[PDB]
């Protein structure tokens, strides 16, 4: 019983802290005997814009363009742009999808946001009905591995940035859970630029160490209480 | 004397509900005598990716590419790509920046995320000393005008999507407030696709009417309490 992993990676520099975290994941999961695939978005020059170029067939309404409607129809007819279907194939086969990225404005870098916007279309990732616990990617695991500029202290309730879980809401709930993913606890590597050489190596080792037993983990309760308490 | 407004618009279809909200804003603000500029991101084929092409000339460290450091240095040395500087000029001169967009995965469409990632660089929108209340864009007003697929009921504390204020956090606090923007109350037009014509017309009317007294509005207390508290 093997497992397949897709790492959607979003950093411009191979020598970056993000690059090291991505490589550590490939090394550890590969060592485990897992099947591993990496979508290096910047290297792929991945298209982030949601446009009519994403559909190649006859549009449902050539007069008024509705991205959601056209992509849902294109998915069912198999007339979506190939770059989108290539990503869907990787996701469809994956047991676990890891997103590796530096936090950009309390969210994912635009190139990765584009991957989410374009790859997770209706018909593929969810249906209406067929979302949240009934999402089409149910049975699959998702995990956000994020790096930040701000420190852990800043990312606390009384901190200037608020608790780190607050900014995970759109990603974990609005996106991943909506599509049916079981969400594993996020891996947040706080302020590596401020950290020391030892601290940086420590965060990298902690990630690799966690991956050793990632398949034994339970997903988080992706609810408002988990994210905001109250 | 007078007021300058920049509308950053992110929708592919001019006939869309978003297009109508953008047009009503232009009409009303223009009628008031305001100076109005619109950045139609899709029509501009606006680049969302944060890459080394955002720096003209030669990089400060061609060994290891650090987007944040490179763009900060480029800003101070007047070596940023023209598409970025064109947007910065519009923002610098604006008294109010309205973002008009459909909610994509509890956030902004990737093309607009790209505008935020690339236009709001260090040195321009903020600096080590000036962030949040001390943000470099202080004195300026920002307003998020968003449309959703989900209904208002769904966007409640106990609703499947959670309170709408939950998804505003990354945008209003992590981005706008961080840059010094005084954040005006968001304009949320819930599920125009489900609503009836009478309701749609009502939503557009409320927007136009709100615009009549926008200069009399006081900014919201962009705090964790406002977004998550009671
Ligand atoms: C547009 C934009 C928006 C942003 N928004 C936010 C935000 O909202 N909130 C926030 O907190 N931050 C934000 N940031 C900060 C951003 O998260 C950091 O700048 C980013 O993490 C820097 O690159 P990264 O790879 O960590 O680290 P670098 O790549 O910065 O790595 C840090 C250090 O780690 C060293 N290193 C690399 N690999 C190893 C290794 N294996 N062992 C030991 N050391 C190693 C590097 O050489 C380097 O000195 C934003 C940045 C940008 C550009
Ligand atoms: C990638 C993606 C991710 C998404 N993620 C989310 C999410 O996380 N959460 C969520 O809630 N939704 C989400 N959505 C739904 C999305 O927000 C809506 O589909 C979007 O708002 C639809 O277009 P819009 O312009 O409202 O409306 P249309 O453009 O859909 O407009 C609706 C109706 O308004 C009519 N209309 C236009 N102008 C006027 C006018 N002046 N007067 C009266 N009627 C008018 C139109 O003709 C149309 O019938 C997502 C969609 C996509 C494609
Ligand atoms: O080039 C850059 C562009 C933007 C940023 C933003 C950093 C930042 C750090 C925080 O702790 C909180 C926050 O909301 C934002 C850093 C570098
Ligand atoms: O092409 C598309 C891709 C994604 C979506 C998502 C819709 C959606 C609607 C909600 O009420 C909540 C949510 O978290 C997501 C719609 C169309
Ligand atoms: Zn959830
Ligand atoms: Zn705030």
Swiss-Prot record, chains A, B:
GO biological process, one term: quinone catabolic process
Amino-acid positions noted as binding substrate in the UniProt annotation, renumbered to this chain: 126-128
Catalytic activity, reaction form: 1-(beta-D-ribofuranosyl)-1,4-dihydronicotinamide + a quinone + H(+) = beta-nicotinamide D-riboside + a quinol
Molecular functions per Gene Ontology: chloride ion binding; dihydronicotinamide riboside quinone reductase activity; electron transfer activity; FAD binding; melatonin binding; NAD(P)H dehydrogenase (quinone) activity; oxidoreductase activity; oxidoreductase activity, acting on other nitrogenous compounds as donors
Cofactor(s) needed: Zn(2+); FAD
Pfam family, one: Flavodoxin_2
Binding site for FAD: 11, 17-20, 103-106, 147-150, 155, 193, 200
Residues annotated as binding Zn(2+): 173, 177, 222
Documented activity regulation: Inhibited by melatonin, resveratrol and 5-hydroxytryptamine.
First-level EC class: oxidoreductase
Residues modified to Phosphoserine: 79, 196
Gene Ontology, cellular component aspect: cytosol; extracellular exosome; nucleoplasm
E.C. number: 1.10.5.1
Subcellular location(s) per record: Cytoplasm
Keywords, ordered alphabetically: Cytoplasm, FAD, Flavoprotein, Metal-binding, Oxidoreductase, Phosphoprotein, Zinc
Note on how the cofactor is bound: Binds 1 zinc ion per subunit.
More about this protein: Uses dihydronicotinamide riboside (NRH) rather than NAD(P)H as an electron donor.
Function of the molecule: The enzyme apparently serves as a quinone reductase in connection with conjugation reactions of hydroquinones involved in detoxification pathways as well as in biosynthetic processes such as the vitamin K-dependent gamma-carboxylation of glutamate residues in prothrombin synthesis.
Assembly and binders: Homodimer.
Stated family: Belongs to the NAD(P)H dehydrogenase (quinone) family.
Stated name of the protein: Ribosyldihydronicotinamide dehydrogenase [quinone]
């Amino acid at each position: 019983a093997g497992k397949k992993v897709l790492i959607v990676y979003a950093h411009q520099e191979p020598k970056s802290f993000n690059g090291s975290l991505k490589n550590v994941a490939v090394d550890e999961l590969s060592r485990q005997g897992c099947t591993v695939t990496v979508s290096d978005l910047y290297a792929m020059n991945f298209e982030p814009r949601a446009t009519d170029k994403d559909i190649t067939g006859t549009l449902s309404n050539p007069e008024v363009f509705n991205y959601g409607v056209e992509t849902h129809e294109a998915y069912k007819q198999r007339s979506l742009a190939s770059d989108i279907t290539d990503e869907q194939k990787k996701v469809r086969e994956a047991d676990l999808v890891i997103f590796q990225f530096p936090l950009y404005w309390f969210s994912v870098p635009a190139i990765l946001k584009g991957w989410m916007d374009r790859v997770l279309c209706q018909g593929f990732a969810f249906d209406i009905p067929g979302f949240y616990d009934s999402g089409l990617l149910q049975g699959k695991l998702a995990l956000l591995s994020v790096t930040t500029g701000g420190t852990a202290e800043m990312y606390t309730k009384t901190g200037v940035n608020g608790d780190s879980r607050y900014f995970l809401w759109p990603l974990q709930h609005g996106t991943l859970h909506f599509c049916g993913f079981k969400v594993l606890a996020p891996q947040i590597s706080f302020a590596p630029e401020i950290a020391s050489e030892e601290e940086r190596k420590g965060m990298v080792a902690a990630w690799s160490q966690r991956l050793q037993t990632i398949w034994k983990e339970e997903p988080i309760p992706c609810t408002a209480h988990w994210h905001f308490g109250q």
